[PDB]
């Protein structure tokens, strides 16, 4: 190609969006934004294929141009705006606030939250560095740069960002015993507690995570997101609480509730 691509085939789209393979030939290409293309949910999919509020792309555009959707407290009018992990989506006219959190299956789940919970979000500290004029700043996972961070904040820590003012309220250090959320790999969407962090200089660090059921799994550090201390998450969790459950029991409880 002689330049950046602008089209996305449905088969090539991220699997977790759950798009019909025969509905059309192309899928919404997320525009540039806070989150990466493969780890983002465009607003069109959320409003049409998840909430079912709109029946087609044009109706989604009509909703957006009416300025009823807010992302992180800001109005967005792009159909393919890349909303992502820990993103707050507010619909005032319908009066709901949603937090984009993966389910156990590995898919963004429609999780409704209260207003007081919608007032803040969490961000994994991807980078800390001194800017121009000797002003420290922190870059989070969603591309937010916050100046004058607390000196104790380091990489791999989590910062509680208030949406209205965009300032850090609290933070969590990355240490053993902390509650973590998996954001990648086939363990995507699971929740557990840190046990040990294995370090390899010049390589990818590995973290051992133990679930509430005592099952243990190892994951690369890049896919780990600290969300609080054990038993005290700073955000409301989706149904299932990030516990992976086998297939036989899946049959079992589906029958039981049925």
């Amino acid at each position: 190609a002689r330049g950046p691509k602008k089209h996305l085939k449905r088969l090539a789209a991220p699997h977790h969006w759950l798009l019909d393979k025969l509905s059309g030939c192309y899928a919404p290409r997320p525009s540039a934004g806070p989150h990466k293309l493969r780890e983002s949910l465009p607003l069109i999919v959320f409003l049409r294929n998840r909430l079912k509020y709109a029946l087609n792309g044009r109706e989604v555009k009509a909703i957006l141009m009416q300025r009823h959707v807010k992302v992180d407290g800001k109005v967005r009018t792009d159909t393919t705006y890349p909303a992502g992990f820990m993103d707050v989506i507010t619909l005032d006219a319908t009066n709901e606030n949603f937090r984009l959190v993966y389910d156990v299956k590995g898919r963004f789940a429609v999780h409704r939250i209260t207003d007081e919970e919608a007032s803040y979000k969490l961000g994994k500290v991807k980078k800390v560095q001194l800017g121009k004029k000797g002003v420290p700043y922190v870059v989070t996972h969603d591309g937010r740069t916050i100046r004058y961070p607390d000196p104790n904040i380091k990489v791999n820590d989590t910062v509680k960002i208030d949406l209205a003012s965009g300032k850090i309220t609290d933070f969590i250090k990355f240490d053993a015993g902390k509650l973590v959320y998996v954001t990648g790999g086939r363990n995507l969407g699971r929740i557990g507690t840190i046990v040990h962090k294995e370090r390899h200089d010049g390589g990818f660090d590995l973290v051992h995570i133990k679930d509430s059921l005592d099952n243990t799994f190892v994951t690369r550090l890049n896919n780990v997101f600290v969300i609080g201390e054990q038993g005290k998450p700073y955000i409301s969790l989706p149904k299932g609480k990030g516990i992976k459950l086998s297939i036989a029991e899946e049959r079992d409880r589906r029958r039981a509730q049925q």
Binding site: V135, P136, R147, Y148, D150, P151
Partner: peptide
């Protein structure tokens, strides 16, 4: 103002 507040925090630490 923000720079001054950061300076105070740094001095206290």
């Amino acid at each position: 103002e923000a720079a001054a507040e950061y300076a105070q925090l740094l001095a206290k630490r």
